[PDB]
């Protein structure tokens, strides 16, 4: 009957989600309310900076998107999806959007700042995580995808660069730029090459099963220290992905390999997360037998490691990036395209 408690939880969560989805928060702060401190990461049309909110003194991570660059890259609807979905969701392993607003030049999303840095950084430095360590993070992704999928959302960009570690050692999922609310199938080609499911590559319609394939790639990369399909150029990576061959380090436990064979499954009628039992084939797999799902959700499980915290506003868990001054044009750019933002 654990199954019925889950359904009840998800039912109320959908209620909450839909209210906000149908009536999105909009224009809830202004640039001059924040002191910009330092860039925490970048992307093709913007950057995320640490900022301090002047009226409260709280730090946040502010994503600043250049409207013109969004348009030139044809990401207008994806950016509208991002903001509309993020303002509507609520889960312990999802970064919160606290304010959003826009000006003549830019869009702005002010989110919680997660000072522990990216999983990417920690994983590359340590080499790989032990199985218990990877399982702890993996479990949080499983619960987060169960949450998001129940709301008809596909996430579509899972990777260590887009998972942050918070002060308690838990995961915060960021980067909703490709997230989409869709019943049935969708066709956009998007994600990150190492993580794309075969059906995205082969230009088929696809669905939330692509996020379960991506979890297979993530667990493999956490536990091996490299991904299951890598090469020097994306086309070589795609050929590996669609080949239907995968090999596992000799140190992977046989339960880990069995779980990954079922997630990294090219045949959709057989991919875990995608069968009649849904996420339950994953939650009940042997590799997760030690996992107490509720304890994980409640953040009662002791984390594998706690990031060094030097203080509020410290960024030493993040790489340094070149800074650039924000310029706000005296003319409104792209007003119609971003009207509902």
């Amino acid at each position: 009957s654990e199954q019925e408690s889950v359904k009840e939880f998800l039912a109320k969560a959908k209620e909450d989600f839909l209210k906000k989805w149908e009536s999105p928060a909009q224009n809830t702060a202004h640039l001059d309310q924040f002191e910009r401190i330092k860039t925490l990461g970048t992307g093709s049309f913007g950057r995320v900076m640490l900022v301090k909110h002047k009226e409260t003194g709280n730090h946040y991570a502010m994503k600043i998107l250049d409207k013109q660059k969004v348009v030139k890259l044809k990401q207008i609807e994806h950016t509208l999806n991002e903001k509309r979905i993020l303002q509507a969701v609520n889960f312990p392993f999802l970064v919160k959007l606290e304010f959003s607003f826009k000006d003549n030049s830019n869009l702005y999303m002010v989110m919680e700042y997660v000072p522990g840095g990216e999983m990417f950084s920690h994983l590359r430095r340590i080499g790989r995580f032990s199985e218990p360590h990877a399982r702890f993070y993996a479990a949080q992704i499983v619960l987060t995808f169960e949450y998001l999928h129940s709301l008809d959302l596909i996430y579509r960009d899972l990777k260590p660069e887009n998972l942050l570690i918070d002060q308690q050692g838990y995961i915060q999922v960021t980067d909703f730029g490709f997230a989409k609310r869709v019943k049935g199938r969708t066709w956009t080609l998007c994600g990150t090459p190492e993580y794309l499911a075969p059906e995205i590559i082969l230009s088929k319609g696809y669905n939330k099963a692509v996020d379960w394939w991506a979890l297979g790639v993530l667990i493999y990369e956490m536990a091996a220290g490299y991904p299951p399909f890598f090469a020097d150029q994306p086309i070589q990576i795609y050929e590996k992905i669609v080949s239907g061959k995968v090999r596992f380090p000799s140190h992977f436990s046989s339960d880990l390999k069995d779980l990954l064979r079922n997630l990294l499954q090219v045949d959709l009628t057989k991919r875990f997360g995608n069968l009649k039992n849904g996420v339950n084939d994953i939650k009940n797999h042997k590799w997760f037998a030690t996992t107490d799902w509720i304890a994980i959700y409640q953040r009662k499980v002791e984390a594998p490691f706690i990031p060094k915290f030097k203080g509020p506003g410290d960024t030493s868990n993040f790489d340094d990036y070149e800074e650039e001054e924000i310029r706000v044009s005296i003319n409104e750019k792209c007003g119609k395209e971003f009207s509902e933002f």
Partner: peptide, 20 residues
């Protein structure tokens, strides 16, 4: 070793999103 092959490849830094 596969690890050594990964470490010597040009895709151990942060990987950019792609799209059409």
């Amino acid at each position: 070793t596969t690890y050594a092959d990964f470490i010597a490849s040009g895709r151990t830094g942060r990987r950019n999103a792609i799209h059409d």
